[PDB]
């Protein structure tokens with residue numbers, strides 16, 4: 001597209017907004033930028049020529065714009081943007097700018113949880129085929145930074161927020177991995193409004209990869225000729241368990257024994273299925289996609305085995321910052337002995353009731369900590385203990401573990417009551433697991 005001579009206004013000075021600044025500068029357009037933070041991080045990366053307004057939005061800049069480029073962090077329902085839309089001013093996001101310029105096929109991945117794992121895994125499947133793939137869309141690698149005429153395939157993690165401002169995506173393969181009651185501040189009309197944003201990913205997609213176990217991932221008008229499904233018990237891509245073993249199964253045929261993979265956990269196996277379906281639909285060779293399943297290590301803090309010693313598996317799932325993530329970790333969980341489950345942190349007022357149905361059975365102990373520890377213990381008090389910190393909880397459970405047990409940090413809560421971020425929380429869990437269970 002051609003932006004020469006337009007008044008372009010960018011909202012947001014995080015890395016996404018900065019990538020938009022770069023995009024226009026590279027095209028000879030000097031945009032204006034604004035951010036409601038007084039001292040946003042990206043301020044000192046801006047060139048001198050870019051006019052900027054911080055500490056609030058500048059309404060007169062928005063109402064004078066030919067094009068407003070809105071960070072995913074501001075709602076279309078915000079009154080300033082509603083006023084600009086009411087006036088007929090075009091509002092887009094970074095992904096819309098990307099899709100107008102992308103010259104290679106796009107695999108597009110959204111969903112409440114698992115987006116990063118599946119995006120990274122499709123990327124690895126492409127690399128195993130020798131494809132110069134561009135993988136991004138997460139906050140640390142905005143899509144616009146990937147644009148390159150040398151790129152042969154784009155694999156994008158897309159949020160519901162980005163999809164709201166995107167109209168030009170034509171994915172070769174697209175998925176909604178799952179939809180759980182999260183992100184509700186931005187979606188006041190509830191789960192179906194949140195879903196509606198994600199459903200945009202299937203518009204003009206050639207193949208839709210849907211979750212056979214989550215009906216909210218089906219296209220808005222239902223399954224159609226484009227749809228390929230993944231699931232636990234059935235679907236085009238599903239899991240087969242027998243004789244103590246598990247296989248990935250595709251269209252009625254085992255394709256891989258999961259013992260050849262490095263990932264753990266039923267939900268990572270369905271992530272692997274979703275990735276394979278997307279890779280297949282994108283035209284990547286099956287053989288190299290399976291090879292990537294055997295070499296992919298997984299992402300840190302995503303149901304990550306940080307220690308297996310004396311028959312005890314210590315699992316860092318610190319990225320489980322919400323109930324839906326922890327629910328998926330507990331669903332289908334395979335533990336020969338006792339599950340020692342670490343829950344805690346800042347729960348953000350969530351309903352933890354959904355977790356209750358997994359916490360019966362005589363082989364479960366709860367170790368609850370952080371701001372909301374007491375609420376988590378109340379799920380099943382007779383098997384629960386409460387401490388202030390994660391370290392205290394781990395020191396309680398460590399003398400009790402026996403071969404066959406699992407120690408699972410899947411907190412269902414944010415980490416910011418006690419840690420700098422979830423990475424620090426998972427890194428501290430890994431250190432303590434080695435201190436306490438490594439010998």
Ligand SMILES: Nc1ncnc2c1ncn2[C@@H]1O[C@H](COP(=O)(O)O)[C@@H](O)[C@H]1O
Nearest residue numbers: 113114115116117302303319320325328
């Ligand atoms: N298919 C899934 N459904 C629900 N949660 C998941 C799924 N896959 C991964 N997760 C968890 O969701 C969080 C975010 O994963 P990711 O988006 O891959 O960083 C981590 O706690 C993951 O272990």
Ligand SMILES: [Ca+2]
Nearest residue numbers: 012014017071
């Ligand atoms: Ca931004």
Ligand SMILES: [Ca+2]
Nearest residue numbers: 011012035036
């Ligand atoms: Ca802002």
Ligand SMILES: [Ca+2]
Nearest residue numbers: 347348349372
């Ligand atoms: Ca609270």
Ligand SMILES: [Ca+2]
Nearest residue numbers: 385386387396
């Ligand atoms: Ca106690």
Ligand SMILES: [Ca+2]
Nearest residue numbers: 373386387388
């Ligand atoms: Ca306490």
Ligand SMILES: [Ca+2]
Nearest residue numbers: 414415421422
């Ligand atoms: Ca956190």
Ligand SMILES: [Mg+2]
Nearest residue numbers: 212213214215
């Ligand atoms: Mg079902």
